[PDB]
Design a binder for this molecule. Structure first.
Ligand SMILES: [Zn+2]
Ligand SMILES: [Zn+2]
Lengths: 62, 97, 81, 217, 51, 124, 245, 245, 97, 124
């Protein structure tokens, strides 16, 4: 059957073009979007105790 | 129609509530629905195999037959296990048929 | 409430897909070698040969072959056998 | 020049968050002896600047191989990782990335009769990482070609829609091999990138800089 | 001006109308974590809207 | 576009006492956020047509070269075996359980947002 | 006559008076890249400084950073341009980055030019409008320039000083040459005692001097040991260098 | 059992009750093309006429034309659908074309259904909202249907009659078969005398009868010659056929 | 710069008011401007011919020379009017040079 | 968007006699047509980059095969002869006279519009 390709360098470079596009697309398009909504949630969940206590000490409304 | 809006709604009500597991009864013979799908699957393969073969039946098979012949052929080009031999016999048979 | 804002922009490709398709095509056409079943000949041979004799039988297999190995063209009968 | 708008909490955003956070969890950062405060924060940021991006690389190789392996299970399509140069070209490229990372830990100089035997077993990792992906995508598809030829021999010879208990038992054997191929498509993209975190994570170690001077008590 | 004060606070934050005005500083404490949770989980869910 | 709370504060300051309680539903709706209305279809974008003609141009081209592949009837009967599992996956995958299982992969959707607990930000 | 026509073309078409006539369109692009190639040219930069003055109020933040570090490298100080630059910064202070503000301040620190509204809007932006680890990515020779610019102008922002003190560590000072590390450690300790602010990461700028005291004088090590005793009772303990291991 | 499974599939999946269950999405598309294939089916068209009634007020003009000529070919007359159709036409009368209105009127002329507000908004649209040579592209068997629908309902719009009289000529009547030309010429002259409007192009619908009077009776030629003398003193002259050349 | 906005304004003031017909004087020697353009045209061709030749000078000409030779070549591969002959002589000359 | 004359008629009807003559410049400007304002550049569209990269990809490809054409120095010296006339056409064509000569080819721009002569459409 088909074992060796017509060019091994053409198939190795197709793998490097596909996997470097996925690297570019992840780093540039996906992971900025991942971290914009992961870290809105994570900064709010980590600051929530110190944010609210800092705001309690600040507003003079009590 | 709107070409994206009609049959999307037709495929939606073919996908969802059109169910031959209940509209054709069929709970009388089948235990679950998880095994109605597990033989509608194998039924799709057996139908699709029998359609692909029959849609061009007089052909010399690329796959190895196991020593079997389809019908009254048995020595013709359809059953010939040498392919350059059967190409010669098909070209003779095509003038007659 | 924002559901109808996301139905407005319809399908869209991934945000750099034209560089993937132009990179996979540029690897399949800039091979630097003849096109898989052909051989480069001289211009004197190409201008002198019919287009039925430039074709090889191996490069035109039959579209749904009744016998395995049927080809559509027959090529040059001037073999060097 | 104008980027697209993303809904928060989309399913591809939730899947790729969990996928990235999985492969990032495979090489976790090591806890310093000191407490992490504003004294230790440049040492922690510099510890992250010297670690390889294996969280990003392993989800690059997860997502490019599971997309290629599952193409082989779409109709009219073959898997690109069923080719020898594609699948072994990803395996050598992980192995070279691990080696280029381990060679730079020094000054790019390459490391009695023991060390040709550590090297061989290490240089075989190159071909074994890619050939395991290639042979799995080839041997599963090849067996499916042979058994579809056998299962076509019965309706070709016998009747169309006739003598159906003979072909039912082999159409369900063919159906359970395409189902195993969906499992091997997902497992071999996982085994390739689990192993990429293991090989690249071997050279993912540097010295914690830390405080050189302190004011105790 | 009292009616205009509470008009802004209940246009922005209408869940404030579920802590009665006399029972408000009975909830407070010195730290924010010490505030009585009688109305905390109710105020958080009325703030999320009518769905 | 200035902020809507300063629009609330301005619209409540320059009303009178008599029409304060009548104006409160038109100051409420002047400061509601925009949720854009469901426009008409204009279906199948200029890129959704490239995606479906280019996928049909791929499926026809792959089925063209599958039909002359020397194992052509085995190749064309593998597309029946492969598409049988695409059919059995539409009928067996719990798609609501899968949707809520991917929502738990992400910590952003596995919980609710957590800051700003309403007793800290009052203005009395 | 081939040499005559080229020499006639060279003395009337390619001069620096037409090099500054194509440079009138986008000023801070051409101002920045020419000054990086070594083109100081004090009265060619005056043509820049008036061609850009109707534009400084609407520049992007990377344009403002390109004006100030070009007019720093050319060493030209236009006081009515540099008030339009600080009115771009103090009107768009949320959009500037610590990478950009640490280069704008070092221009404003050479040319001794400050405002109180500018010193607050640079400190408000480094502390609140920018990531808190942006000092860690800065390099300690730029942070010491920011520390003295707030001590020259007598501006005590104790929130800014806790932010800039993150970017002093063994990591950030180890990337400096020991001629430049000494010029930074003395410059950072002189600013830390001017406010009397001794953070817990002052023990990395002190320990950058006491681990190699053979580059320092006894006058400068008296300056260093004055800050060490001033920081020891503030942090509540005694200094101790660490031998690694 | 191959024949049994197909016959069981044919009696429960492909029937006309599921053919009208996919036809519920877009009604006037499926209503029009099925009726052109010969699918009348009077009580399958009642499922159409109620599935489309919440949509008739917002249909495009080519959808409204598709409803009426389908419900004309299926001969089904839903009076509370056909008032929603004439309220689509008389609310969007500027958007309809003479090609579309001449097919809507011929449906409304079979099923004797009219309004005065509809008869004005069809005549306002053919005369003013449409090109004045759109009757010339019409074919005189459709214009005679419009002429009698205004004479049945007693509606005298002398501006519409000058417009429809353009589309009567030797050209437009010559494209008719002489069975259909006779049914049109008598139908057009009966409407032209009901209003007493004798335009200068009545001498082409009269001359379409007097050039071949062997297809007409003496009763119908008395009808024709009544209009000829009525038009001769209106136009101020005498009729004369022309031998060509 | 803005890449479309700088040199569009530079080319605009090179196109329009940058004029070597007046900045280099040149009305002293030329009658009109319609004949300054009619020999800046021919000057552009003579410069462009002399640049294209000189940018690769040692070449055997495809065009027919009229029986002339460039410099001290005269019997070499550069002046050889038989092209398969001069290919042999160029390959010998390339090892030496 | 209703018509601006009915907006003028409504805005003049519901004003008083005292503030009629003051309101006439804000009813004038409420019924002026929109002339959209000059936005920022965002230069060189996604199709102006295809048009210039595709023209550079054509000029390089045509100059590539011109340089191996057996008359390669004659082919490359014809592009100098052809581009010499593109230069002489920028310096000889009267481009304002050509613009106003094409405006006379079209009868729509060769004259002024002609209807509606102002004494027929008064409303006194
Ligand atoms: Zn296959
Ligand atoms: Zn040419």
């Amino acid at each position: 059957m088909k074992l060796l390709p017509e060019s091994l360098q053409q198939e190795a470079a197709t793998a490097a073009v596909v996997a470097s596009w996925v690297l570019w697309h992840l780093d540039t398009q996906l992971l900025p979007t991942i971290m914009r909504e992961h870290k809105l949630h994570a900064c709010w969940a980590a600051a929530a105790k110190r944010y609210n206590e800092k705001l309690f000490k600040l507003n003079p409304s009590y | 129609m709107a070409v994206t809006s009609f049959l999307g709604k037709a495929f939606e009500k073919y996908f969802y509530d059109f169910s031959a597991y209940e509209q054709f009864g069929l709970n009388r013979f089948l235990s679950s629905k998880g095994q109605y799908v597990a033989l509608r699957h194998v039924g799709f393969v057996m139908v699709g195999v029998n359609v692909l073969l029959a849609a061009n039946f007089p052909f010399n098979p690329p796959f190895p037959t196991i020593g079997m012949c389809p019908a009254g052929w048995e020595g013709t080009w359809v059953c010939q296990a040498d392919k350059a031999k059967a190409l010669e016999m098909y070209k003779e048979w095509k003038k007659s048929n | 409430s924002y559901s109808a804002y996301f139905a407005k922009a319809g399908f869209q490709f991934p945000a750099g897909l034209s560089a993937l398709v132009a990179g996979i095509v540029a690897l399949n056409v800039c091979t630097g070698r003849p096109t898989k079943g052909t051989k480069e000949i001289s211009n004197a041979e190409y201008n002198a040969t019919p287009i039925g004799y430039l074709q090889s039988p191996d490069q035109h297999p039959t579209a749904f072959p009744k016998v395995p190995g049927m080809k559509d063209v027959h090529g040059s009968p001037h073999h060097h056998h | 020049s104008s980027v697209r708008d993303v809904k928060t909490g989309s399913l591809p955003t939730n899947f790729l968050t969990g996928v990235y956070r999985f492969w990032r969890s495979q090489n976790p950062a090591e806890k310093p002896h000191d407490p992490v405060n504003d004294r230790l924060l440049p040492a922690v940021v510099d510890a992250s600047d010297k670690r390889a991006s294996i969280g990003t690389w392993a989800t690059t190789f997860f997502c490019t191989i599971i997309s290629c392996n599952l193409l082989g299970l779409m109709p009219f399509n073959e898997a690109p990782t069923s080719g020898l140069g594609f699948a072994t070209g990803l395996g050598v490229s992980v192995w070279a990335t691990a080696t280029i990372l381990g060679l730079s830990k020094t000054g790019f100089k390459f490391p009695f009769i023991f060390v040709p035997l550590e090297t061989i077993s290490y240089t075989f990792r190159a071909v074994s990482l890619g050939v395991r992906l290639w042979v799995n995508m080839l041997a599963g598809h090849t067996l499916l070609h042979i058994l579809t030829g056998m299962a076509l021999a019965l309706p070709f010879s016998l009747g169309f829609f006739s003598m159906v208990p003979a072909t039912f038992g082999v159409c369900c054997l063919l159906s359970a091999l395409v189902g195993l191929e969906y499992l091997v498509a997902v497992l071999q993209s996982g085994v390739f990138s689990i192993l990429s975190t293991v090989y690249v994570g071997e050279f993912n170690h540097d010295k914690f800089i830390g405080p050189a001077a302190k004011i105790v008590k | 001006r009292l009616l205009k004060l509470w008009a802004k606070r209940l246009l922005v934050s209408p869940e404030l109308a579920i802590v009665p005005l006399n029972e408000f500083d009975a909830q407070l404490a010195s730290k924010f974590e010490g505030i009585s949770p009688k109305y905390q989980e109710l105020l958080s869910a009325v703030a999320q809207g009518n769905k | 576009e200035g902020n809507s709370v300063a629009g609330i504060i301005k619209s409540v300051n320059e009303t009178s006492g008599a029409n304060l309680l009548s104006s409160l539903k038109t100051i409420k709706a002047q400061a509601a956020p925009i949720y854009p209305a469901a426009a008409s279809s204009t279906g199948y974008s200029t890129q959704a047509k490239i995606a479906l003609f280019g996928a049909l141009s791929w499926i026809l081209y792959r089925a063209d070269g599958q039909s002359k592949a020397h194992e052509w009837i085995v190749d064309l009967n593998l597309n029946v075996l492969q598409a049988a599992w695409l059919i059995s996956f539409s009928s067996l995958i719990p798609f609501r359980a899968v949707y809520f299982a991917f929502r738990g992969m992400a910590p952003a959707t596995a919980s609710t947002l957590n800051g700003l607990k309403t007793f800290s930000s009052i203005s009395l | 006559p081939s040499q005559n026509l080229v020499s006639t073309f060279a003395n009337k078409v390619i001069v620096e008076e037409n090099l500054v006539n194509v440079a009138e369109i986008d000023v801070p692009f051409w101002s920045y890249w020419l000054s990086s190639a070594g083109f100081t040219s004090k009265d060619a930069f005056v043509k820049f400084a008036e061609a850009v003055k109707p534009k400084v109020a609407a520049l992007s933040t990377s344009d403002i950073t390109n004006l100030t570090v070009a007019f720093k490298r050319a060493n030209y100080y236009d006081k009515d341009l540099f008030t339009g630059i600080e009115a771009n910064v103090s009107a768009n202070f949320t959009k500037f980055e610590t990478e950009q503000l640490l280069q704008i301040v070092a221009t404003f620190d050479a040319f001794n030019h400050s405002s109180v509204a500018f010193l607050d809007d640079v400190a408000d932006s480094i502390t609140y409008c920018n990531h808190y680890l942006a000092p860690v990515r800065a390099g300690a020779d730029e942070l010491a320039t920011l520390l003295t610019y707030y001590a020259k102008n007598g501006h005590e922002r104790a929130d800014l000083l806790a932010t800039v003190a993150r970017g002093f560590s063994e990591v950030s000072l180890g990337k400096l040459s020991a001629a430049q590390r000494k010029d930074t450690v003395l410059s950072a300790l002189k600013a830390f005692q001017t406010f009397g602010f001794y953070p817990e990461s002052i023990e990395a700028v002190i320990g950058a001097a006491l681990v190699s005291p053979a580059e320092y004088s006894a006058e400068e090590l008296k300056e260093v040991e004055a800050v060490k005793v001033a920081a020891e009772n503030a942090l509540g303990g005694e200094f101790v260098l660490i031998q690694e291991g």
